[PDB]
A paper describes a structure:
Because the length of the side chain of arginine is also not that different from tyrosine, we designed a ThrRS_Y462R mutant. Although the guanidinium group of arginine has less inclination for the donation of electron density due to resonance, we wondered if the β-lactone could covalently modify arginine when it was properly positioned. Not surprisingly, OB only increased the Tm of ThrRS_Y462R by 6.5 °C in the TSA experiment, which was higher than that of ThrRS_Y462F but significantly lower than that of ThrRS_WT or ThrRS_Y462K. This result suggests that Arg462 could not react with β-lactone during the relatively short period of time in the TSA experiment. When we cocrystallized ThrRS_Y462R with OB and ATP, we expected that ATP would exclude OB from the active pocket of ThrRS_Y462R if OB failed to form a covalent bond with the enzyme, as we have observed in the ThrRS_Y462F structure. However, the result was surprising in that Arg462 actually formed a covalent bond with OB, while no ATP was observed in the pocket. This result indicates that although the activity of the arginine mutant is reduced, it can still react with β-lactone to form a covalent bond over a longer period of time, as it takes approximately 24 h for crystal growth. Another discovery in this study is that β-lactone can modify arginine, although it is not highly reactive.
Author numbering:
A (entry chain A), B (entry chain A): 242 to 640
Write the structure that this text describes.
């Protein structure tokens, strides 16, 4: 369970000194990355999230307008063009407010949930980088919710359900939730903080979540929730966050017309469920020790012949499986069946179809699994129906 | 047919002076963008392309090693960290060679086709920017093919079929193909250029392509093909390119073991079919004048009630359509049916389901189209089956 070693073994990705802290996603690693996006997008559709894409760099004046310049100028890559200074974005938050600021918003547009798979960059010191855990370039399952003060409870509830629903898919059921203590220096009136804290307390009680408080001084712009998961080694990984913001929407001139026809500043909720998706892939790689679940496996099926007679039967089978949506490969090499089955077992391919002369004549296929289990000859249509169920259900275990 | 005006009318995207030449993709514009990616990925799977993701910035030493530094340093955004200079990538080519350089390659790995939806940036002068046509940040349907000299014909054939197959999906059937004349200053032996030119000439003859030559001096690293399409206004848009490269793989120390067991440098083919996908969306926006085909339309169906009695019937219908994969919205507003049908017609929603008291009791739905055609009451299952066919076929016209 070392994601850097398994990543090299499975040809998932690589890094080199020319771009420290930035991942070269290979084909198989990118397949895992994109399958994660499909999973998140499926959850986004459930909770009615927009998906947007912001610009990678933005004017340094805009970043100074947010107030994040002074606090995080060290971590921000800077670039220039035509006597103007630009910042490679370390966060997606101001860009979403820019999209929100387009057009007039009323209360009828709230809550407005805006998600983005935003590529962000941070100038982290090189000595602190490690694999996919600590990088300079990363993609967050980020989203921001624009809502009234009244909707804070209902929106935090949805984030809470999202965290537990999503972590459970991967097998993470032990979750520790920590709440933040309000600092001395804070933005926003005390009554605003008091009302929002009641919203958070009611939401956490509603979901029956035992929560602890954190010794850290907490964020100045709002109350913060952090979700930590535990992998099969009982290792704690902090991935989720729900951060309230009373500062940024006021700074970036965001507003909406309320029911009373009065100009109001929306409440802004920052939330990520998995956090850094590169980091989450590394966590998943160590969690499964390379035995990725079928829906996450880069190559899900390999079909092999025994000799060249079955080689054309294999090619039809590969096409029939590929049309069914299965990520399949054909192994027609001039190696005998024990060699290929072992090699694809070592590469963690979930299923392995053996096509002998009996298999060609029967119309069936001989099925082996990467754990060495022999499921015997099965109907080709039956095989497809079972993997499709395993893929669509995103099941954690095989047949 | 002005994509900037239609983009504002349909809330597709926006741009602001804080990030000149970079697009804020709104939800509906991002839906078109992502649907284009799915279309390209479907074509990638047909031709057995890998999909990878490279780092956004790379060491300036690596860029100087390519030789693109001296020619294109002006157009490249530069940034630094820890006394080292980095370049925000304007091209995906060197990053793919880096991924190719991982692991030992043999001739049995060739041809190796490597595609990437790579976000690239160029420091284009601000006065030259225009909408999505001329931007600083763009995403290309880029790919690179690593192959032997012998495979150049078969690979150019696949690129040629890809260009015509993909342009035809959008209704672009008039295509002008231009070939490049070899310059005085060139990289690679004359015999290499002579053999590759024969490969290109045979490939273009094979597909029966009438081609012209270009007065431009042509690329120094290899022969170049450019594909121009014509929209419904008979306007020429140059989108596709197939560029041969004898220079870069040798520079970046790329190699493979041949059949003769000799260390050889692969031939590199750069190819993009649509080119800048932001630019292609703008072309598509003007081609359809906002009447996007059903598979490309941001919102494909709107269901409306006449009064609150049908409001709960509409919500079930919206869910049943959404589970079927249709991008659908519910319009339960307190406006009468003529108001809503007109508003969604003005917003170019392909289909429009009207749910009266007759519709609730029958189990059917009243169907209108954005062209004003009345298709009458239809079965809800029948409606779903027809849009699914229209979406999956990517048909250019409605029922
Ligand atoms: C405060 O605004 C906080 N933002 C978030 O925590 C946040 C989490 C998840 C999703 C979104 O959209 C969020 O805004 C803070 O700015 C986080 C942060 C810390 C450090 C740096 N840095 O430049 O080193 C950037 C952002
Ligand atoms: C020559 O290498 C040429 N590259 C391409 O034309 C190309 C087209 C489509 C896909 C890929 O992967 C390609 O490499 C040239 O470098 C193109 C180019 C021109 C200008 C600039 N610029 O920095 O202004 C960059 C790239
Ligand atoms: Zn945020
Ligand atoms: Zn290239």
């Amino acid at each position: 369970r070392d994601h850097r070693k398994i990543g090299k073994q499975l040809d998932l990705y690589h890094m080199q000194e020319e771009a420290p802290g930035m991942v070269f996603w290979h084909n198989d690693g990118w397949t895992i990355f994109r399958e994660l996006e499909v999973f998140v997008r499926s959850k986004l559709k459930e909770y009615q999230y927009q998906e947007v894409k912001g610009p990678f760099m933005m004017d340094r004046v805009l970043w100074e307008k947010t107030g994040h310049w002074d606090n995080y100028k060290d971590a921000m890559f800077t670039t220039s063009s035509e006597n103007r200074e630009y910042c490679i974005k370390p966060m997606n938050c101001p860009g979403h407010v820019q999209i929100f600021n387009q057009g007039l918003k009323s209360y009828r547009d709230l809550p407005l949930r805006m998600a983005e798979f935003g590529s962000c960059h941070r100038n982290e010191p090189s000595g602190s980088l490690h694999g996919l855990m600590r990088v300079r370039g990363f993609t967050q399952d980020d989203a921001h919710i624009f809502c009234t003060e009244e909707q804070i409870r209902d929106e935090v509830n949805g984030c809470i359900r999202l965290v537990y629903d999503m972590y459970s898919t991967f097998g993470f059921e032990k979750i520790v939730v920590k709440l933040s203590t309000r600092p001395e220096k804070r933005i926003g009136s005390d009554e605003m903080w008091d009302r929002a804290e009641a919203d958070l307390a009611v939401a956490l009680e509603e979901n029956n979540i035992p929560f602890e408080y954190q010794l850290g001084e907490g964020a100045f712009r709002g109350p913060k929730i952090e979700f930590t998961l535990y992998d099969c080694l009982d290792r704690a990984w902090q991935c989720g966050t729900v951060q309230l913001d009373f500062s940024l929407p006021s700074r970036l001139s965001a507003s909406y017309v309320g029911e009373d026809n009065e100009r109001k500043v929306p409440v802004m909720i920052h939330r990520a469920i998995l956090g850094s998706m590169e980091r989450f892939i590394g966590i998943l790689t160590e969690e499964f020790a390379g035995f990725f679940p079928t829906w996450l496996a880069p190559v899900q099926v390999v079909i092999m012949n025994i000799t060249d007679s079955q080689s054309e039967y294999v090619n039809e089978l590969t096409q029939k499986l590929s049309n069914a949506g299965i990520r399949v490969k054909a192994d027609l090499r001039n190696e005998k069946i024990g060699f290929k089955i072992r090699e694809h077992t070592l590469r963690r391919v979930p299923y392995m179809l053996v096509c002998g002369d009996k298999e060609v004549e029967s119309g069936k296929v001989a099925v082996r699994t990467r754990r060495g289990k022999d499921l015997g000859s099965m109907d080709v249509n039956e095989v497809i129906e079972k993997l499709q169920q395993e893929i669509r259900s995103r099941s954690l275990k095989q047949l």
